[PDB]
Amino acid sequence: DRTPLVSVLLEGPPHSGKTALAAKIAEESNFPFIKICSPDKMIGFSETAKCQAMKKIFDDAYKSQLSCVVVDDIERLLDYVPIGPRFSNLVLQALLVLLKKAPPQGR
Amino acid sequence: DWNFEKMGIGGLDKEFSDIFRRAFASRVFPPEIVEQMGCKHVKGILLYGPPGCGKTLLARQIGKMLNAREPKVVNGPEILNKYVGESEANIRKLFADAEEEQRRLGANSGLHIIIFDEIDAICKQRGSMAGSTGVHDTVVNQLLSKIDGVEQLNNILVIGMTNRPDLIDEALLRPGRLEVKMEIGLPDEKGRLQILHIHTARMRGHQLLSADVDIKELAVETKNFSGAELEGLVRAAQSTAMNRHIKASTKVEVDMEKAESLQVTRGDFLASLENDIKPAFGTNQEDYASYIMNGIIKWGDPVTRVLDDGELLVQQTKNSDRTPLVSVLLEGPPHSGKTALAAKIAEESNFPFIKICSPDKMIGFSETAKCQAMKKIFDDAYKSQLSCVVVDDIERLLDYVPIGPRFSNLVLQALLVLLKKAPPQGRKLLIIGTTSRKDVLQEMEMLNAFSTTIHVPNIATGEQLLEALELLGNFKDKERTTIAQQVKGKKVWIGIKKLLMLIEMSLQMDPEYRVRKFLALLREEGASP
Numbered sequence: 001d002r003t004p005l006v007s008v009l010l011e012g013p014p015h016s017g018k019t020a021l022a023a024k025i026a027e028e029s030n031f032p033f034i035k036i037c038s039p040d041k042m043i044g045f046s047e048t049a050k051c052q053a054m055k056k057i058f059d060d061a062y063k064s065q066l067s068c069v070v071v072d073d074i075e076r077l078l079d080y081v082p083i084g085p086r087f088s089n090l091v092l093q094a095l096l097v098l099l100k101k102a103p104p105q106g107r
Numbered sequence: 108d109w110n111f112e113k114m115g116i117g118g119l120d121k122e123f124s125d126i127f128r129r130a131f132a133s134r135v136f137p138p139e140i141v142e143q144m145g146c147k148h149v150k151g152i153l154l155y156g157p158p159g160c161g162k163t164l165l166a167r168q169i170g171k172m173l174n175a176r177e178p179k180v181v182n183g184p185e186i187l188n189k190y191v192g193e194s195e196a197n198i199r200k201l202f203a204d205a206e207e208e209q210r211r212l213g214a215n216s217g218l219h220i221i222i223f224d225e226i227d228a229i230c231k232q233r234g235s236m237a238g239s240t241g242v243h244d245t246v247v248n249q250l251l252s253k254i255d256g257v258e259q260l261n262n263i264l265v266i267g268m269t270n271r272p273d274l275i276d277e278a279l280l281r282p283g284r285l286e287v288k289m290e291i292g293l294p295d296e297k298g299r300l301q302i303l304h305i306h307t308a309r310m311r312g313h314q315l316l317s318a319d320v321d322i323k324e325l326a327v328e329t330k331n332f333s334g335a336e337l338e339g340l341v342r343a344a345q346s347t348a349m350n351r352h353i354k355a356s357t358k359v360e361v362d363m364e365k366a367e368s369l370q371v372t373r374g375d376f377l378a379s380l381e382n383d384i385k386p387a388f389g390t391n392q393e394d395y396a397s398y399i400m401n402g403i404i405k406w407g408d409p410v411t412r413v414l415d416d417g418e419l420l421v422q423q424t425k426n427s428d429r430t431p432l433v434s435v436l437l438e439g440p441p442h443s444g445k446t447a448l449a450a451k452i453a454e455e456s457n458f459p460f461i462k463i464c465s466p467d468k469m470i471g472f473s474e475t476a477k478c479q480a481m482k483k484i485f486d487d488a489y490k491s492q493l494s495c496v497v498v499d500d501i502e503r504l505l506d507y508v509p510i511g512p513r514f515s516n517l518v519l520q521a522l523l524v525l526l527k528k529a530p531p532q533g534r535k536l537l538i539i540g541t542t543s544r545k546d547v548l549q550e551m552e553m554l555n556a557f558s559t560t561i562h563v564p565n566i567a568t569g570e571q572l573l574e575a576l577e578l579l580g581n582f583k584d585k586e587r588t589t590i591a592q593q594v595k596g597k598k599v600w601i602g603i604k605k606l607l608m609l610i611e612m613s614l615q616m617d618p619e620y621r622v623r624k625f626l627a628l629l630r631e632e633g634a635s636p
């Protein structure tokens with residue numbers, strides 16, 4: 001009741017099989033609303049498009065009584081690369097703001 | 108039990124039964140029971156597929172059977188204007204007949220069908236991609252207000268056609284609106300046979316076609332042809348046969364008997380198939396001669412190793428489950444002659460769909476155009492049972508220069524994402540890369556994405572050079588003996604392309620000084636890795 005929002009992060013070496021475990025744990029919940037936001041469905045998009053998609057998906061999730069949102073391959077969304085380094089600041093700021101926002105009362 | 112198989116349709120027989128079961132179940136039963144139930148009819152359907160797989164004929168036949176009035180064809184790009192609030196008038200004008208009939212006859216009017224085309228043209232989803240194509244989103248909303256809204260229409264049916272099923276607004280697929288999807292994929296052997304049979308009914312009746320020609324041979328030979336290509340082949344064959352006959356008649360004053368006869372024969376079909384028609388979804392034999400300029404000569408063991416490994420990979424990818432995607436990379440020093448070997452191994456697969464994407468056709472394009480072209484090529488490749496895509500030079504695509512360093516991030520991300528996306532269920536794919544700087548490429552963290560690597564070495568021994576020259580055959584016996592004597596030091600490190608260029612340079616003088624000039628040039632390039 002006093003902790004309406006929760007977060008959990010999975011990390012490990014490459015080719016360890018993280019996405020499958022995330023999908024399984026999301027499925028086992030039996031919640032009425034579930035959604036996955038993969039990067040492969042935004043090929044060639046610009047940062048504004050990605051932020052708009054994230055905002056739309058989270059807004060849609062806000063309207064239920066229980067929900068589960070999966071975000072896959074976080075490092076890939078930011079457009080990271082060891083040389084440089086380089087990345088899109090806007091996406092990171094948007095995600096940081098999201099990850100500590102509570103839904104309306106009673107959800 | 109329908110009978111359309113032989114009149115206009117031809118290949119596509121199951122799609123009719125599927126669409127009839129899914130959509131028109133209500134209009135085939137006596138009206139009494141349906142009016143007792145009080146259910147409504149579907150208010151439209153959507154179609155998507157390759158450009159020229161026979162979509163319009165489906166709509167025309169469906170309209171004809173239902174005993175409806177004349178369809179009101181219309182095109183997508185045509186309905187667009189730069190003036191404020193002028194597209195909406197065009198959209199509204201379409202339904203006028205439907206409204207008039209509804210007003211006058213009440214609930215007993217017939218059926219009117221409106222056929223859009225390239226409906227994806229008018230949509231605000233395209234603006235999401237890189238560009239400015241908001242197309243005044245308002246437009247689409249207007250359309251909705253005619254299908255549904257305060258006023259109710261019950262004598263309409265909307266059929267939509269599209270080529271990019273991922274660019275359709277999500278709001279245009281909810282219940283009560285366009286709510287039935289279907290796919291129209293490429294034909295098969297039987298479909299090709301039926302299409303060729305139906306398009307060749309005219310000549311058979313008049314005995315004009317020769318008895319020599321068969322239909323099974325042409326059916327099997329055409330692997331991945333589409334609808335329009337078959338009729339194009341027929342027309343080209345007719346034209347070439349007529350031209351040959353008239354030219355032969357002009358050359359020789361043959362008796363009348365043969366003059367009246369205009370048998371098309373079989374040679375015209377083969378010539379036209381092999382020379383005129385270039386399928387968009389099939390192998391292009393012409394491009395191969397543009398890359399393998401001088402064939403392949405076996406100067407050492409490694410070539411056989413590379414060819415064998417490529418054949419092994421091809422066999423593994425052909426027949427196997429649990430692994431529908433395969434990747435491989437080629438590495439070597441500059442001028443090692445990589446592209447030719449990759450093209451050869453791709454050609455030897457005998458696959459139906461082979462494509463080569465190189466910066467050759469991509470000068471002056473902006474990065475966004477590059478990503479668009481890459482996505483288009485891969486999307487096209489996705490629409491075949493087997494495919495083989497070649498990426499010519501990874502380094503040039505990324506726009507890499509050691510100073511800086513500098514490069515385009517969007518293309519790198521797009522390529523990395525694409526390399527790890529399996530095709531739809533039950534279809535295979537193969538990807539082959541090529542580069543000349545593996546150190547930077549590994550530093551960029553992409554070498555982990557590929558699944559295997561191969562090495563292409565250069566020439567490093569004198570006897571190898573002697574064998575290469577002998578196979579090329581440009582030096583005489585005493586010249587070869589002198590070259591062998593002078594090259595016994597064994598300090599040779601050169602590439603094949605450089606060797607050919609240097610031979611051409613050396614052969615530009617009188618025969619007396621060829622050997623000395625060639626040896627001087629070879630020693631001048633004294634590399635020592």
Ligand SMILES: Nc1ncnc2c1ncn2[C@@H]1O[C@H](COP(=O)(O)OP(=O)(O)OP(=O)(O)O)[C@@H](O)[C@H]1O
Nearest residue numbers: 013014015016017018019020021022023072073527
């Ligand atoms: N117990 C298991 N743990 C992990 N993966 C499993 C397990 N059992 C089967 N698998 C298979 O492992 C693969 C997991 O692929 P997945 O995309 O999750 O890997 P990954 O290394 O997390 O990927 P990514 O490249 O996105 O980091 C799937 O084929 C799944 O079927």
Ligand SMILES: Nc1ncnc2c1ncn2[C@@H]1O[C@H](COP(=O)(O)OP(=O)(O)OP(=O)(O)O)[C@@H](O)[C@H]1O
Nearest residue numbers: 399400401402403404441442443444445446447603
């Ligand atoms: N066995 C062979 N190996 C390599 N090249 C060969 C062989 N036989 C003939 N050639 C000729 O060598 C040339 C190979 O050119 P290719 O485009 O492959 O060079 P490359 O070093 O891969 O080029 P780049 O790195 O600049 O793209 C062509 O002329 C080809 O005809």
Ligand SMILES: Nc1ncnc2c1ncn2[C@@H]1O[C@H](COP(=O)(O)OP(=O)(O)O)[C@@H](O)[C@H]1O
Nearest residue numbers: 116117118119158159160161162163302334335
């Ligand atoms: N299944 C088929 N059977 C016979 N002809 C076909 C078939 N599919 C396409 N065609 C040929 O294609 C032509 C129509 O092409 P169409 O499908 O209208 O192209 P588009 O979809 O780009 O408008 C016709 O001349 C027709 O002969």
